[PDB]
Amino acid sequence: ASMGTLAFDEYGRPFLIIKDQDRKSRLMGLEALKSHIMAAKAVANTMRTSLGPNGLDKMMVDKDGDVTVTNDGATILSMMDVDHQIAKLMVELSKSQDDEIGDGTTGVVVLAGALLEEAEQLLDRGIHPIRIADGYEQAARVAIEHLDKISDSVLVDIKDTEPLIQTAKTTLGSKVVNSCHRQMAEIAVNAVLTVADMERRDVDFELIKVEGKVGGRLEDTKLIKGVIVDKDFSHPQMPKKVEDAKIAILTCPFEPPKPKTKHKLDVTSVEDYKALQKYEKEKFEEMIQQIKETGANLAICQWGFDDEANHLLLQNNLPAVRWVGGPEIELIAIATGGRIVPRFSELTAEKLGFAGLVQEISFGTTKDKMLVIEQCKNSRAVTIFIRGGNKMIIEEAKRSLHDALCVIRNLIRDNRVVYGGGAAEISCALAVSQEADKCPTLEQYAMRAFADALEVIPMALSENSGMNPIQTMTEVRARQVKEMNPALGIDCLHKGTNDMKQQHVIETLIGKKQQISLATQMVRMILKIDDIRKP
Amino acid sequence: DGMITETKGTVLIKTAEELMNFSKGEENLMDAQVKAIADTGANVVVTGGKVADMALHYANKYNIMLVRLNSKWDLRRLCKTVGATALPRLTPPVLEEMGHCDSVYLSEVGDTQVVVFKHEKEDGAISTIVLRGSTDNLMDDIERAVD
Amino acid sequence: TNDGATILKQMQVLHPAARMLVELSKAQDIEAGDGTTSVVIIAGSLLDSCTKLLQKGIHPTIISESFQKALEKGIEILTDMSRPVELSDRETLLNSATTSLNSKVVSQYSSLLSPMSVNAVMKVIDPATATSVDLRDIKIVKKLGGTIDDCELVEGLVLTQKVSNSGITRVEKAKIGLIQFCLSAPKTDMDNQIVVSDYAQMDRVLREERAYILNLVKQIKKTGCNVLLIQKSILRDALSDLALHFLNKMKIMVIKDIEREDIEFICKTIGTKPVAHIDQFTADMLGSAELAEEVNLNGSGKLLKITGCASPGKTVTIVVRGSNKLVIEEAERSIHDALCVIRCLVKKRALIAGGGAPEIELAL
Amino acid sequence: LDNKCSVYPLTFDKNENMAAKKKSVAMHTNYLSACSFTNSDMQILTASGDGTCALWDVESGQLLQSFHGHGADVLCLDLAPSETGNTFVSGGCDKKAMVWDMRSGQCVQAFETHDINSVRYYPSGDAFASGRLYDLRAD
Amino acid sequence: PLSVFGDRSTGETIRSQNVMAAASIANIVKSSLGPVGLDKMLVDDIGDVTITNDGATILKLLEVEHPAAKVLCEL
Amino acid sequence: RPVLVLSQNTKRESGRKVQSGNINAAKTIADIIRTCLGPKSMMKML
Amino acid sequence: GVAFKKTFSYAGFEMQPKKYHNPKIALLNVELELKAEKDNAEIRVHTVEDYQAIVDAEWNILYDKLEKIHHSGAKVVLSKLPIGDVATQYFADRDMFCAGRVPEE
Amino acid sequence: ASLSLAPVNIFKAGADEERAETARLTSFIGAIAIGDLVKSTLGPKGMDKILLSSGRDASLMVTNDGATILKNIGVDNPAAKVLVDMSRVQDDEVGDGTTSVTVLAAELLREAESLIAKKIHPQTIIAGWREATKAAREALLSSAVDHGSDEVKFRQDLMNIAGTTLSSKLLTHHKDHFTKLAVEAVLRLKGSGNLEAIHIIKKLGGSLADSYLDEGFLLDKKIGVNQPKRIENAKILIANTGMDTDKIKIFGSRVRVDSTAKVAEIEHAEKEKMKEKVERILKHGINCFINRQLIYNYPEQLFGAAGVMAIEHADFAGVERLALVTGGEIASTFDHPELVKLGSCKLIEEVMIGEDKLIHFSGVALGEACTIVLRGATQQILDEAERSLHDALCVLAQTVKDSRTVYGGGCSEMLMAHAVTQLANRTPGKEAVAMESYAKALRMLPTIIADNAGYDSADLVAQLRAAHSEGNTTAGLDMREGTIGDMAILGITESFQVKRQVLLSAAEAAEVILRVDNIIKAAPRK
Numbered sequence A: 001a002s003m004g005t006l007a008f009d010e011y012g013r014p015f016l017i018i019k020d021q022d023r024k025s026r027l028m029g030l031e032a033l034k035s036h037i038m039a040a041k042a043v044a045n046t047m048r049t050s051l052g053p054n055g056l057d058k059m060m061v062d063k064d065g066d067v068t069v070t071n072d073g074a075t076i077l078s079m080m081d082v083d084h085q086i087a088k089l090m091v092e093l094s095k096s097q098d099d100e101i102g103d104g105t106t107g108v109v110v111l112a113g114a115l116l117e118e119a120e121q122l123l124d125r126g127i128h129p130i131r132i133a134d135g136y137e138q139a140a141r142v143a144i145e146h147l148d149k150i151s152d153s154v155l156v157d158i159k160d161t162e163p164l165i166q167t168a169k170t171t172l173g174s175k176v177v178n179s180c181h182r183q184m185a186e187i188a189v190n191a192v193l194t195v196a197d198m199e200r201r202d203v204d205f206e207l208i209k210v211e212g213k214v215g216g217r218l219e220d221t222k223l224i225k226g227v228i229v230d231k232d233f234s235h236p237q238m239p240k241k242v243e244d245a246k247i248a249i250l251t252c253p254f255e256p257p258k259p260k261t262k263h264k265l266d267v268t269s270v271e272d273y274k275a276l277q278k279y280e281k282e283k284f285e286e287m288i289q290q291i292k293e294t295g296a297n298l299a300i301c302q303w304g305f306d307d308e309a310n311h312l313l314l315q316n317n318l319p320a321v322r323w324v325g326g327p328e329i330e331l332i333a334i335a336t337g338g339r340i341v342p343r344f345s346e347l348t349a350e351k352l353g354f355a356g357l358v359q360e361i362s363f364g365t366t367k368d369k370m371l372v373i374e375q376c377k378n379s380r381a382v383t384i385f386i387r388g389g390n391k392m393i394i395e396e397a398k399r400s401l402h403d404a405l406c407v408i409r410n411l412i413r414d415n416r417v418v419y420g421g422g423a424a425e426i427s428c429a430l431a432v433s434q435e436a437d438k439c440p441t442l443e444q445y446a447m448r449a450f451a452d453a454l455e456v457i458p459m460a461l462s463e464n465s466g467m468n469p470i471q472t473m474t475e476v477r478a479r480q481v482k483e484m485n486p487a488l489g490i491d492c493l494h495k496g497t498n499d500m501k502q503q504h505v506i507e508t509l510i511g512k513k514q515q516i517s518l519a520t521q522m523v524r525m526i527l528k529i530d531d532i533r534k535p
Numbered sequence B: 001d002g003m004i005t006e007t008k009g010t011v012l013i014k015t016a017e018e019l020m021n022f023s024k025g026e027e028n029l030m031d032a033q034v035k036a037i038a039d040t041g042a043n044v045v046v047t048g049g050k051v052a053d054m055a056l057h058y059a060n061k062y063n064i065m066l067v068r069l070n071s072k073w074d075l076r077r078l079c080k081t082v083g084a085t086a087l088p089r090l091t092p093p094v095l096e097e098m099g100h101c102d103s104v105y106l107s108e109v110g111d112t113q114v115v116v117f118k119h120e121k122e123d124g125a126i127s128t129i130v131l132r133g134s135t136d137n138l139m140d141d142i143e144r145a146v147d
Numbered sequence C: 001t002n003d004g005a006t007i008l009k010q011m012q013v014l015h016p017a018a019r020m021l022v023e024l025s026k027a028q029d030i031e032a033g034d035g036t037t038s039v040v041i042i043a044g045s046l047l048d049s050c051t052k053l054l055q056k057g058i059h060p061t062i063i064s065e066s067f068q069k070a071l072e073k074g075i076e077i078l079t080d081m082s083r084p085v086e087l088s089d090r091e092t093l094l095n096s097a098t099t100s101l102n103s104k105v106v107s108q109y110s111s112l113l114s115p116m117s118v119n120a121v122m123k124v125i126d127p128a129t130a131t132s133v134d135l136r137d138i139k140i141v142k143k144l145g146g147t148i149d150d151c152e153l154v155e156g157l158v159l160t161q162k163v164s165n166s167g168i169t170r171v172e173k174a175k176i177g178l179i180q181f182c183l184s185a186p187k188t189d190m191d192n193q194i195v196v197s198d199y200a201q202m203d204r205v206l207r208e209e210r211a212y213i214l215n216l217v218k219q220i221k222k223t224g225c226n227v228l229l230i231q232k233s234i235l236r237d238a239l240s241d242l243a244l245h246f247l248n249k250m251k252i253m254v255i256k257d258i259e260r261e262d263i264e265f266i267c268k269t270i271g272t273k274p275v276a277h278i279d280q281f282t283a284d285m286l287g288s289a290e291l292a293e294e295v296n297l298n299g300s301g302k303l304l305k306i307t308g309c310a311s312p313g314k315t316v317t318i319v320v321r322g323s324n325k326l327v328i329e330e331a332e333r334s335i336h337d338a339l340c341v342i343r344c345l346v347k348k349r350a351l352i353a354g355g356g357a358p359e360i361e362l363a364l
Numbered sequence D: 001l002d003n004k005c006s007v008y009p010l011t012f013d014k015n016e017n018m019a020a021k022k023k024s025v026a027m028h029t030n031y032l033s034a035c036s037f038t039n040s041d042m043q044i045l046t047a048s049g050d051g052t053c054a055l056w057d058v059e060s061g062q063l064l065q066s067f068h069g070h071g072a073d074v075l076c077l078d079l080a081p082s083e084t085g086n087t088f089v090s091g092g093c094d095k096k097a098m099v100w101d102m103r104s105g106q107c108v109q110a111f112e113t114h115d116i117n118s119v120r121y122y123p124s125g126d127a128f129a130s131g132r133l134y135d136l137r138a139d
Numbered sequence E: 001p002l003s004v005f006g007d008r009s010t011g012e013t014i015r016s017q018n019v020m021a022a023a024s025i026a027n028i029v030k031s032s033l034g035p036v037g038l039d040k041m042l043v044d045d046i047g048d049v050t051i052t053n054d055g056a057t058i059l060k061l062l063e064v065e066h067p068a069a070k071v072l073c074e075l
Numbered sequence F: 001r002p003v004l005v006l007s008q009n010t011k012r013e014s015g016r017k018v019q020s021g022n023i024n025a026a027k028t029i030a031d032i033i034r035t036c037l038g039p040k041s042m043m044k045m046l
Numbered sequence G: 001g002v003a004f005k006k007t008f009s010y011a012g013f014e015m016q017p018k019k020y021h022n023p024k025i026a027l028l029n030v031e032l033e034l035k036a037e038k039d040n041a042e043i044r045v046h047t048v049e050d051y052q053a054i055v056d057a058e059w060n061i062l063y064d065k066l067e068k069i070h071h072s073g074a075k076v077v078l079s080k081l082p083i084g085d086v087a088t089q090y091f092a093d094r095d096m097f098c099a100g101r102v103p104e105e
Numbered sequence H: 001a002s003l004s005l006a007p008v009n010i011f012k013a014g015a016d017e018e019r020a021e022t023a024r025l026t027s028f029i030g031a032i033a034i035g036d037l038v039k040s041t042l043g044p045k046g047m048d049k050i051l052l053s054s055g056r057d058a059s060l061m062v063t064n065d066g067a068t069i070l071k072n073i074g075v076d077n078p079a080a081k082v083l084v085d086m087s088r089v090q091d092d093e094v095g096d097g098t099t100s101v102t103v104l105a106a107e108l109l110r111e112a113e114s115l116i117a118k119k120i121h122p123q124t125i126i127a128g129w130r131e132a133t134k135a136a137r138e139a140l141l142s143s144a145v146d147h148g149s150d151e152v153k154f155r156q157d158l159m160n161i162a163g164t165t166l167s168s169k170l171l172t173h174h175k176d177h178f179t180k181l182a183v184e185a186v187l188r189l190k191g192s193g194n195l196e197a198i199h200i201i202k203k204l205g206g207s208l209a210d211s212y213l214d215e216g217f218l219l220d221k222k223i224g225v226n227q228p229k230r231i232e233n234a235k236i237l238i239a240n241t242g243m244d245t246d247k248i249k250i251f252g253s254r255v256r257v258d259s260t261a262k263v264a265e266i267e268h269a270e271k272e273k274m275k276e277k278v279e280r281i282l283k284h285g286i287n288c289f290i291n292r293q294l295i296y297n298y299p300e301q302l303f304g305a306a307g308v309m310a311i312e313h314a315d316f317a318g319v320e321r322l323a324l325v326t327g328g329e330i331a332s333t334f335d336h337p338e339l340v341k342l343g344s345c346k347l348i349e350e351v352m353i354g355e356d357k358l359i360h361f362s363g364v365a366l367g368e369a370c371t372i373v374l375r376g377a378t379q380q381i382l383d384e385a386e387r388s389l390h391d392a393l394c395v396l397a398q399t400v401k402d403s404r405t406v407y408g409g410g411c412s413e414m415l416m417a418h419a420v421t422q423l424a425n426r427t428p429g430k431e432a433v434a435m436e437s438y439a440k441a442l443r444m445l446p447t448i449i450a451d452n453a454g455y456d457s458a459d460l461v462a463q464l465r466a467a468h469s470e471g472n473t474t475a476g477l478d479m480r481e482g483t484i485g486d487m488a489i490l491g492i493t494e495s496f497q498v499k500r501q502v503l504l505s506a507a508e509a510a511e512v513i514l515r516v517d518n519i520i521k522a523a524p525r526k
């Protein structure tokens, strides 16, 4: 049953087929499926305690000892050091949910674990696993159709951000930033709405810069309609604040020009030496005067520069910053409305950006200075500056804000929402159960198991909130059947009502559909495996 | 490709005009050489060495089929079976040195991609037997039988 | 060694308290230069008393405050029991130096070293105005061989470098010049190559290089200089062999490989202004001296001594000699202790009795 | 036994052919992780076990600048493309490669996606081997 | 799951293993059947030599560690 | 943990090789004392 | 049609428009960036005016290639070879699209 | 089933996970161990530790600073890592409070452990703690007093703040002298926040009371050979030029001639170029010249012949401080003498400090840059004095930036705890229990302060609680004898920013650690 086959032939002579066959292992048939289901159940049960507003974080430590306190399912599974292949499949499922949607990376794992757990008892009764997979696919189609049916539409206008704010708040409710919950949702919504193509087109996350710095308080996190640069004015005696700055973006180092090709300049006489010295001095003066002629008040370079250029810039009342990174150059050019100029001779007034205020920012007793460019006219780029009391909450706030931005992006793509709190899962389970009654008996078991697996999310929310899972879920389902209201869910926060619509617990329909689809496909793929051949 | 000196090459640039004209003149020279080769009526070019990008571009422009043969045995066998002389430079071939084949095309047999220099007469210097089979060992045995 | 600081530094103590005692000894050496063992003994005795004080049930902060009060009272007592001194009183200085040297290995030689140390300190300061002594103005040179009785106080400059010239080892009425450039083939800071295309260019290069070197040497000689010191140079030959030949043919002693850190000391000693370009090399930047000769230490090496200078400005040299290296090092440490004690007299004009009298009076 | 190298070229016995000026600073002692000579022979970059890159001048012999900011000891460092103000990278045990500029004495750029021990600049200078490849123009 | 300190084989694996063991035992003595059968020579690792055609003797002298083969030997 | 239908140290040889080996062994035994036959035989030291 | 992943855009790429309604596509095998004219090339000048002329000549070579591409009327530029930041910004200024290092397939 | 307690093994070799009991236990043990370690160094009667490095150098460091203690230790417990990072961030944001925040977080986590033992869901604890933190922060803000308007009252507040910050450090022996020192140093900054403009020079030897603030500035560089060693009415020119083998920035340039005469001519041309450079510099009419980079022998002799004192190799910090203290402009080009401002000072000379020679700038023009000389009997004493001054200077700079002050000596902790208790008394549910535990930790802070002094901590804390409930809002611990007293009268004040940051950071880190229910570790590299 293990290690494969071993006979050494019926004639005694050696019988070796596969290299190192005595050192390899093999699991076949039903026990392989049981082992896979057990591993997936272990992963899902580990993850399910971090589901909902009352979820608890997992403290992940990598190989170098660095600590990552987090609640994101995809991050937890990514940093988890697993060796089982099915656990790796779970990790990849979470990564897929994170990439496609950005939220619900924990619900997919719990759903997959529940599906495999039900499939275990289905297999114990002699049902072919392919039949279970087919029934799961049928029930998933039914559930997706039901979600589309019970979905609701919201307005994604910029003059009314209340539904967007509510959706972002629902996304952030399970994270540590729920103390600054409304401010976080506000800044995420404003960031996404600022940088987006309004015809339901994509949202370029490269235009959202998420920057973190320790110190201050978490409430100090703010959205800046500009660029926050990790640099400062090159000369220490330059003014620290420039207002109504005419910005010149340059990618040419403020140095004498140098050909790219292998070049040698020959000095053959004293006159040649004097001419070379004069050429150096004149090039410095000429580049500075060319920058000044455009009327610019501030210069940004990408490749740094030398002492003569620095003092010439200071002498002409031209604040400047050097060694600004390429992406930061692009962001500054986008925000300020100025073009990127590759050399001084091509610099004109019309290529200058505009910033209402450029300032150098200190951070207490730390000697670190960071540049701020803001008050642009029609900035198409934003920066989220995150403060905190330690680096760990800063990283957690970064990923929570990323979740909120992803959710608003999904709303931009499709403006159909479904009320969460387990209401969607309960209604889907009810629809699946109703459709299973009309089904012929054989697939009925798979569909019923799918409904029972869908029931896990409200039960996990109930147990995480301290309530009795089965009683609460049963009562909520009975209320959903009695009165036509697919919005009744689990009162995780004990607000006194079961209706998620008044509680404004809002989830994107795309997220739920992706959750169900991905979970069903991964469960089918795991059910189809019946052989393992690890070394 | 454009042949270079066997001793050592160094493009000595002393003026801006030379710098701006060197690459353009080199490309024009390559175009002239390829067009001179094509104007003889040649439509298939076989080379034993590497193929430069500009040379390939100008060969594509003039509708010339390019086949590269690494082995010199293959080059000599192709010269025998076609009737061509392996030119040592990139000069256009004279009428005696331009070999002729009744059909050259790219084809796929099974999985592998092949280039076929096919005659139609029941003669020629070299004849090829294509061996099919379900196993490498079986085809090796059939090749031994053919030998 | 008998020096407390050296003893504590050499032995690698591992307990943190011992490390802080070593640091305390270093600080006492820095501020005073003597009493380096006494301060450590005092600290050890104080902590030994703190043992019984703590066992009696006394909080450490109370002990520290009481010790601070005792220290203030003790400073008052010590100041009261002392007497003032004047730097013109040579006997007091000699007695202080002798008392410094009693505990060291150089005690039978104290009759030679105590006046030597007092003279060394007095020669580098202005007694009427000096408020501190820079001991870096006193250079100590250790040469093996001989006996500590052979220790000498040189009023001029002593250089351990060897004379490049052979046959010129003694110059009277010397005119020393200090050079910071190189006497070799011309070489610019930028990359430079000489391109030869004709046969005539070869010997033209040779002749022109010879002419350049000859012109440099002639310009040097025209100022009347006869002793030449060449600063150590890297990336360029400081002294070409052809340049050395020309200098030797013009009867000029040449000393090369002069260390960069010693330029200030040499200029302060013999009154020479360093020259970095041949254009600025003139007679007024030379340092006149009475005699510059290279002496031999009876087969134990050679020394270049420039004794007698027109401007002997606040700088003296001490030559320390001995039978073996260990006693030479200990003699250097002891002489340093004596110099530090005279420095203490310079800083604070107050004298106190010794032999445990301050400690007994303080205890009572 | 363990050494078998005490008689190494330390003697450098020649006929005084202008190559004897090897300098051999060795003032800081410790561990000379990288004694690379700058393309302009005026300056020497040295890295020690303390994690600080040190720049020395061969002529004066004085420590120009000590470059600190690396998380761990700098195992390897390189030089600029040709001179370009000697914008040099520094790879150490802290998994991070960063660029320094003496015109300001600051870490101009940093990269962390890998200990780096085989830094080597691209001939153009827009990138450098990270034995990976980091692009200067795109960070 | 079982946590039994041993190895387990189930299904077609054990059945085929038993068949292989029985077939090996049969092939050991299959060559000593009938008038044109030929005897064997057994060496007992201390130099003792046994030349025989009887199946029972051959199966008793052989040392066997597979229990199905043991079943055939006792048969 | 090999299956080991037979013991680990059990070796089997069969076929023409066995017959050739037996006949060659008998020939070798004969060749040992071939020369010790007849009135003109030579003695051996054991 | 054809679709492929984004290929390591340079600075100034985000300023290029990301949708066209009848573009003309220039499929190139060309390195559009400032670089040594040739591997064995070596420039020898003895005058500062010649130095400046050489620098401007390199820049003019790059800008001549870019102008030839732009005047063709194309709006999407695809290359098998790297496209530098200078070319990226040049195309962004003209509301053009560029993508270097496209795989050959 | 569990990820580790399952029949199938889902981990690599060395990977490990810790579930509810084990995770909470490890977190609480680590946090409480950190808090116990860093405490007993708290309050005026706190003591110092010894940090022995196990490396090759075996560096020795005695200190009272909590952040430095927590930074240089080998911490493997992840919750302890969280607390260490929190202390480091607290040090970065404000100078002081590193020990207080760690102790507060440890006490909060200990109370959380007790509450968990009492079968209270950690989410309830977190909610109660959030409400308590809001109430305490509001009370502390309402209790703040601002004196930034009145000059004399603000100076008194600066005195009191510096004294309170220094009271727990080794400088408490000369607290008055060092308080005057630090306040003068900060006030000389003219409102600038540049703590780098204050230079602390540690010279061994001498007593700690010999430390002083130089009325001008002290530089640890050297003067050239032939240059003057004393300048009166100096005209400074601070520069950042090469001034050494100054090569043309045209990097492909080279000398290619056909004779050595031409090479000699080019060399003379280079020397003439440097001479013209020096002449251009001298045309500004200056007496002194500070260059950031090196000055080689030829420019050095040119300056000496000109009778101009040239100081070489003053690093970026040096030239910045000289510009701040003298008002000069750091110049790198000299084609416009009239556009460059020159520094000025009454006198420049060389002074002896111990056995080292330093350059002394006296009668400086601006003086917005300070040099503080520290004298001590040991290196460890010098380092600890420097750390203590750094804390004091940081707190004083923060107070200058934000003049709001709150009373120390446990007064703020009692007030916040009383507000939290008042809130809890009106709150139903176990959130009230969580709020009460919050107040218990807040009161435990001055309890530890009094315990470190050997006093009767319980009685004093009870008296403080009674006084604060009665309405005596300024009552606090009087460490002089061991009673309670008026903190306003006794002059123990603290920066409102520091106390607010301590509260907020401690509460936030306790909340972060409390949310953890599982610890998963990857296989270590070693």
Ligand SMILES: Nc1ncnc2c1ncn2[C@@H]1O[C@H](COP(=O)(O)OP(=O)(O)O)[C@@H](O)[C@H]1O
Residues within 6 Å of the ligand: A050, A051, A052, A053, A055, A073, A103, A104, A105, A106, A107, A170, A171, A172, A173, A174, A175, A420, A421, A422, A457, A461, A490, A491, A492, A493, A505, A507
């Ligand atoms: N205020 C709330 N009341 C009830 N349920 C909620 C509330 N906020 C979130 N939930 C539910 O908690 C579940 C988990 O959400 P969360 O942990 O934020 O992300 P993920 O879906 O990745 O686990 C969601 O399905 C959502 O329906």
Ligand SMILES: Nc1ncnc2c1ncn2[C@@H]1O[C@H](COP(=O)(O)OP(=O)(O)O)[C@@H](O)[C@H]1O
Residues within 6 Å of the ligand: C004, C034, C035, C036, C037, C038, C099, C100, C101, C102, C103, C104, C354, C355, C356
């Ligand atoms: N000739 C002497 N007679 C009595 N006491 C002496 C004599 N010489 C030195 N001492 C005492 O010996 C003590 C130790 O001095 P020494 O060993 O020279 O230096 P240190 O104080 O550093 O140990 C001094 O306190 C001094 O008073």
Ligand SMILES: Nc1ncnc2c1ncn2[C@@H]1O[C@H](COP(=O)(O)OP(=O)(O)O)[C@@H](O)[C@H]1O
Residues within 6 Å of the ligand: H041, H042, H043, H044, H046, H066, H096, H097, H098, H099, H100, H101, H163, H164, H165, H166, H167, H168, H169, H408, H409, H410, H449, H477, H478, H479, H492, H494
């Ligand atoms: N003279 C004093 N009287 C009473 N309490 C004091 C006094 N000085 C300091 N404290 C208290 O000691 C506490 C801890 O400060 P300290 O031990 O200096 O280090 P840290 O501020 O880093 O914790 C502060 O909260 C302060 O209120």
Ligand SMILES: [Mg+2]
Residues within 6 Å of the ligand: A103, A104, A171, A174
């Ligand atoms: Mg979520």
Ligand SMILES: [Mg+2]
Residues within 6 Å of the ligand: C034, C035, C036, C099, C100, C103, C337
């Ligand atoms: Mg003594």
Ligand SMILES: [Mg+2]
Residues within 6 Å of the ligand: H096, H097, H098, H165, H168
């Ligand atoms: Mg404090």
